[PDB]
């Protein structure tokens, strides 16, 4: 995020980091229950990648994080990589997340819910802060 | 890249207005947000765009794509969760 600010630690408890086996953060995701993470299809997750829950500072060794293995990758069959449309994948975890003060689920909308133009929302992540 | 988790508030756009920036690249399963002085950027992909509804944070978008320079005056594009939630629920029910 360019021109954002640091979050309060633990205040976005559904936010996960997707890391490869070298420990490199490559994408975010959101917990929707103890066993499932929603992310983007174009992130190209495999079952060798790891879901990290409960993290704030990726440079700290002292946080009580959960490193969760992925059982199966469900890429939406309507995903179109040429247009990046329908850009969603579900990850089923091999090991359930343990919910706590710092790890819990985001709500999903109904299909008919309305979010109007001009509404102020929030996005979070560990993406670049400057290009 | 940052070590510490970042946040930003930003407004939702209509797809019709987002098309002034991105043209025919904007499809019905996308939602635009930003152009407000902040931008999602590389490494944010897959994470949440959440809006508060009836007191609870609800997943409205999934960070998807946008400007190759993360310009803060151009909207970011997110996967539109309302268009996708029926597939989420079908997948959870079957697995």
């Amino acid at each position: 995020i360019v021109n954002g600010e640091e979050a309060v630690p633990g205040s976005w408890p559904w936010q996960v980091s997707l890391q490869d086996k070298t420990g490199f953060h490559f994408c975010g995701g959101s917990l929707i229950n103890e066993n499932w993470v929603v992310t983007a299809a174009h992130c190209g997750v495999t079952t060798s990648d790891v879901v990290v829950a409960g993290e704030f500072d990726q440079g700290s060794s002292s946080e009580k994080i959960q490193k969760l293995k992925i059982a199966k990758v469900f890429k939406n069959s309507k995903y179109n990589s040429l247009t990046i449309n329908n850009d969603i994948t579900l990850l089923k975890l091999s090991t359930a997340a343990s919910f706590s003060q710092t790890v819990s689920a985001v709500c999903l909308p109904s299909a008919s819910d309305d979010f109007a133009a001009g509404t102020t929302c929030v996005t979070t992540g560990w993406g670049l802060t400057r290009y | 890249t940052p070590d510490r988790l970042q946040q930003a508030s930003l407004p939702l756009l209509s797809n019709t207005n987002c098309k002034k920036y991105w043209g025919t690249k904007i499809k019905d399963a996308m939602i635009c947000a930003g152009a407000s002085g902040v931008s999602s950027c590389m490494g944010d992909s897959g994470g949440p765009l959440v809006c508060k509804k009836n007191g609870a944070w609800t997943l409205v978008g999934i960070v998807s794509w946008g400007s190759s320079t993360c310009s803060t005056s151009t909207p970011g594009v997110y996967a539109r969760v309302t268009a996708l939630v029926n597939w989420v629920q079908q997948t959870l029910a079957a697995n």
């Binding site: 983007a40 | 991105w22 590389m42 944010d44 794509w65 400007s67 190759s68």
Partner: peptide, 4 residues
């Protein structure tokens, strides 16, 4: 554009 670029994937994010």
């Amino acid at each position: 554009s670029w994937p994010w």
